[PDB]
Design a protein around this ligand. Sequence first.
Ligand SMILES: [Zn+2]
Ligand SMILES: [Zn+2]
Ligand SMILES: [Zn+2]
Ligand SMILES: [Zn+2]
Lengths: 58, 567, 115, 46, 473, 193, 105, 33, 100
Amino acid sequence: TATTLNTPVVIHATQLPQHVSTDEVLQFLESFIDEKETNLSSSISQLKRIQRDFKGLP
Amino acid sequence: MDISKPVGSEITSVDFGILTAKEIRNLSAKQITNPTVLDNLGHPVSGGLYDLALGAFLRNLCSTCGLDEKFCPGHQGHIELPVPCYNPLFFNQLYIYLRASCLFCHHFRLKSVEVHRYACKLRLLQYGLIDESYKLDEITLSSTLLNELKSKRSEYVDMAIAKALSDGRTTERGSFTATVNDERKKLVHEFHKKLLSRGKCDNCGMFSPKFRKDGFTKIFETALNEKQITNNRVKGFIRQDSTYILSTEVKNILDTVFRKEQCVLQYVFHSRPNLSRKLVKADSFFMDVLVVPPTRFRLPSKLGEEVHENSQNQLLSKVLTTSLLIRDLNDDLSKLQKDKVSLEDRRVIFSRLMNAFVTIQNDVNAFIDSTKAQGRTSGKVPIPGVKQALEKKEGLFRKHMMGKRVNYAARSVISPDPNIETNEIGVPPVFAVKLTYPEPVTAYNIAELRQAVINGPDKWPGATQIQNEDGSLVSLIGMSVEQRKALANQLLTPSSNVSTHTLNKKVYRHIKNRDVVLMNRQPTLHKASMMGHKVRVLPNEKTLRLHYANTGAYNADFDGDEMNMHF
Amino acid sequence: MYKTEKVDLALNRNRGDPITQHFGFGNDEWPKEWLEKLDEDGLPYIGTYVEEGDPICAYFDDTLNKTKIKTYHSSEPAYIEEVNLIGDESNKFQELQTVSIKYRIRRTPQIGDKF
Amino acid sequence: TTCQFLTKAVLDNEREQLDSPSARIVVGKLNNVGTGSFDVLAKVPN
Amino acid sequence: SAAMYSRFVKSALDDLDKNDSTQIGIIANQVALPSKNPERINDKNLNILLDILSSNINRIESSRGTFLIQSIINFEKWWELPPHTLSKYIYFIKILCSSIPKWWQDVSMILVSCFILPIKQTVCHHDMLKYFLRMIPSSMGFIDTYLAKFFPNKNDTRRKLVNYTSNLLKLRGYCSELGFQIWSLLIEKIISIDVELQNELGIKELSTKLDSILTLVSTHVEEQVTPESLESGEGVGVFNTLTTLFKTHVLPTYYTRSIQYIMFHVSQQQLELMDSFLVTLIDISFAVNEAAEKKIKSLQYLGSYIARAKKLSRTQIIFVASYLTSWLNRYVIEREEEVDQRGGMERFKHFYAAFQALCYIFCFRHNIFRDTDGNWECELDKFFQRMVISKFNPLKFCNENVMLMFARIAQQESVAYCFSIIENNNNERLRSSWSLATRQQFIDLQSYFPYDPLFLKNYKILMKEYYIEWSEA
Amino acid sequence: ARFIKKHKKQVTNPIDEKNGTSNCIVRVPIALYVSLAPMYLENPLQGVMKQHLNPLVMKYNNKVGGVVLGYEGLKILDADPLSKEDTSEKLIKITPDTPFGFTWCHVNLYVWQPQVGDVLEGYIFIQSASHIGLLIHDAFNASIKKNNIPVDWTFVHGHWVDSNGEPIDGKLRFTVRNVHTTGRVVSVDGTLI
Amino acid sequence: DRLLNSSDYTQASVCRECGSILTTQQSVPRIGSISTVCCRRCSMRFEDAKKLIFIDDSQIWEDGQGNKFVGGNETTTVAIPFVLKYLDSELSAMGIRLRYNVEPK
Amino acid sequence: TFIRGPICGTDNCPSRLWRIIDGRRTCQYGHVM
Amino acid sequence: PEDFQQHEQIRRKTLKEKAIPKDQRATTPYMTKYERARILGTRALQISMNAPVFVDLEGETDPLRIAMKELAEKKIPLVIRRYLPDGSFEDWSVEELIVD
Ligand SMILES: [Zn+2]
Ligand SMILES: [Zn+2]
Ligand SMILES: [Zn+2]
Ligand SMILES: [Zn+2]
């Protein structure tokens, strides 16, 4: 479970969230997936599935 | 305290204030109503003082969090007082404002203009503006002039604070030094003296009946004197456009005065600017509920084999009985019409009510406070109330903060030794084998700590246990040499867990010559009676050995005097 | 040094009450290492070396249906010197409830002793 | 006279700024004297 | 009955829309009973209750419905239900966790805990895990921790342990992404295997335990790793994670007898697996960053491996000799000058460590280093002598028993003559200095050989094809 | 007079074109106060990533009110307020009691934040008489309860059938009723009325 | 160490919002969910909160008795001497409130 | 050293608690909590 | 929310204006006996938990001794923040302070 070693003491948004186009979501997924190549493995796997959908696939 | 459990949040200041009956009711885990504490099978009575909502008790689990007597922090509940009581802490201040009041126009009997002059000064002092508060008094150019005077003093205070904020001299949080605090305290004293110094109200010209007290918090009202009743009806046309007095009457009087005189009170009751913007209410001097502290602060005691009830519970249950009893008086009281109904019962109902109020007020006094309680059965000596527990004997500060009972460490008769260094202390193996530093295991010490763990609890220099990365301890006590050799070979295995990956194991070793302890001989009247010595373990010794060069510092004689060794 | 301790298992009983606890052993299953320190009566053999935690007394408790044991408490080991059976008056009939055990502690003179 | 000074603090709605040695011991804060009179920071490259 | 019960429940649900909640609770309590109590709801009625609840699960997704649901998830030995009824329970659970993912947490926990049960009895549990891992991939988190939580203890029954690993292997084969964490768990059991066996080298217990576990693990790996599986498969994945766990657990702790034979054995499945291991060992034993003790442990591993691993090719061996003499020749050429300078012979731990490994390798495989001519690969005749007479005086600082055996063999082969240097060495001894505070750990480290013979009955037999006993060499 | 009511779902998620769904992917800048372990003293960004950020990926986070997809542009705020935002040497204050640092950081989060009211599309993966189970973006769980499906829709043994008697399949368009976030993984409650 | 470590060192929960160390408790969760740390002062009884927008799931917690609450999730832990808790407790018996200002907010 | 009670706070027992005066409490395999 | 950001920036800015220009520093260029002890202890603590070490250990097993060694070669990556009584401060690097 959560300790000061794996969890931020506090988190705050500094701005209102800005919506992003599909073309942007794709450019971000692209680079984030590349840069990060057990929990992280199974997660980029899921991201890989999402980027697949944003390109229209299965 | 563990260097591998850091804390991110930090307390930076503490604010003093008063619990409102609304807060209490909201936070409460259970309303307590039963004087009886246990049943025939020793279980907590529901709605009683050991009710399990207030925390785990004995075997039982806490009904609020579900935790055991060990991990359950306890939770507070409340008692509902069927009738308002004066908070015994504040009764003197209540007395001052009550006496100062005009029961007719509901301002203080001190002329409004003066009261405003105090409000101006105190407000300036919230910002530390001492010079300005004297300049305020320099302001002068009958009721039309006065409001212009009030007004121009007011615009001076604003201008001064504005100016003070623009340059360096203050923040919106105020400025509070000793010289400021001194000026503030004088003014409040001066103000209170002037409040009580008035007879006739300077504002409406009427006389209010005088109020008198007890040392047991009862308030009497002395009816009006002859000249004064005459004076009062002469002013009768302008207004057209002894006895015990209940705490409820007193509260109503102050409630209104606090509304009217709110401006001044806003600064009398705040040494800093009141950013919170909360009104100053009369309720603050009264209690409609009592907070029942958590069960873990009210446990029974065992005097050897016999078990004794908790004294704070004995006091709280007396509040509880009186409470039920008043809730019954209140029940029969409503079953009047007496639209029919013959008057005199009015006198007897009052008699019973006075009785209830007095004795609950006594029980509260006794707790804050046994002082405020009527001495029992002439003898016995009073039982301490909460006030006396916090203040009793030498007190929490002296008995548990200045000084403490301590845990790791040792004590022994000292013996002289010319053969150790003047900065060492000769430690007997009997100590050396039981005292451990918690040593964190690293590349640089894995050899050493392996050996310690192999050596075990009883061969010096050894070890008594291992702390794992998940904080858990493993005892080396019951163990064979092989089991120990096994644990010694897994001291430095990698992490199989991301959450503890930053930690290493710890070995609770015996201490050695590399080490430093703190030596102490009492009385400790200067710092050299508590110094750091380098450890030197000496075979076959049963006492602490100390070089002569240190007697001076410790004032030690070697006549069977003892020292403490702290690790 | 000699210390005398009084073991009196009539300490709880409410005055001339039925007797729950009697010196001796029950027939339930209990350690057996106990007989190293204690004779058949549940009293310790005279002369026995006794260190912290050892039995100095054994009785059978009725309310527990178990055989229990008063243990030696000093951190300084000792030997049993005298064991006195303090019988009761008020004409016999009453069984053993009170015992005095006198411990003997060796003092070869130590560091810190005063002369 | 603990309860007297406490009563005074409450009626002033005082804030304990926690600067005195006594106050810091009360709340468990590192003392303002001594090796505590400055902060330490690490110079990190890259 | 049949239709009476259909009414009873249908009523209960109406009564639940009204919040009376009694009828349901009566039912729930009836299903919650233990596998033993005769009064627990029987199959036929349960068939009914289930098929009715499945048909409109939304009727139950309420605070009032919680208790009923909890009682069905907690149905004892459900995997033990009769075919037809078992099927209705499964369909219900399927239906439940689909419309309400929240309960998947509760269902899977119980599932994992059933991993202590034999393979034949778990099909339904895996079928369900496979299903919901797919549809709720986010679950992998907490369900992984379950893998931790419910691992049988070392004390617990062997059948429990052997089962709970059999299942984890099965799980691995349909939820790859958990694959590493799994292998990490088994290995970290790892430490218990290290516990079992070295000290002993009850004990009869740990033997057959640790023996049943390893033989399992390795046979599953023999199947998981195969050339077909290596080009297009997850064979690669398994080797990787087993090699990683070797570098992080086996090597350091580095006094294990159970356990390093997993790598000994997988290694020798295919030529490249061997290649990867050798070069991996070489890396660790000569990397500039690593701590000297790590370099010394690797070098022991390296030497033990080359000596023992039967499936090694002449040239892979000569490869290691060629690396060692090469690295050694350089050491002496660049460093001998530092000996008569200030410091001790410990400055050269690493030199002796490597020279040991090479000597050791020569003991077991000297018959190979003679090429067709009868000449020595790597000029071993000329090379050994040079080191033996160097200023490092290896013979004095390396393991005593190996240096002795090397002497014997080397002398026999006209390769080198050390025996006078030895004489001189323990003469100078009776009458080149190293503390001994730290000199012992080295003697300790040089005494351990991670692939000296195994003492576990079965594993031994299994290893024979992959092992060279001293008698063989 | 009192506003805890600043935990009210303000998504707003816009409807799309050329399309009909709501775009719920959003980029939010955050500040976060985190610990830095001593092992990372030479790699502080690496350490902030491995300790704090990586574990946030593909989990719901209560503060950004959605699932965190990932992060860009991590920056440590130097405890030395006098340095240039440029320099690669920074100060991190060390705990009095422990060797751990604590620093503020700025980073950018990409968040999938489906609020109530939004229109999403899911891939049908399961059909009982009790609910329809969908997968949004082939990643997040959705579920339409039996009585959020319109009344004239019927069921068979199984698979659903609509208002006009034809079976439904694959992509389905629904509106967000509630978003459950406290379980192991996020789950969306959707409606068709 | 002596006050610090011997003394009665204790990691304790505070509500960052009301500044109390006496009104926090562990939530009691449904099976499968994880317990969280909540403030009894700063949270509404569930009924009363409905009676005044949609309410998120993470914002509800329950005690052992069974009452549901909305809010009160602004808690952390601070290191205090245990005897502080006793003093604060006694003070609240006397109707007095200590309010600890915690940072970071 | 026995008291049987309090099983063991380690889910690979539960093996069987004796308390030492130092308050570690010790279970046979050798958890000290 | 936008303005708390602003509030923080103001706090942090004024703190630095206390924490001051390098070239306007005015306190002793000598490391104080207090600063030395804490620097040693704290750096020793970090060493005990696998901080990258900037010097050759040469057999040392006491992390305090390792720190002392680092101090001697001026390889301790710590900075002392000295507070003047108004709360403003001067940052001094361990390497730049004269040690004795
Ligand atoms: Zn509790
Ligand atoms: Zn008046
Ligand atoms: Zn709160
Ligand atoms: Zn255990």
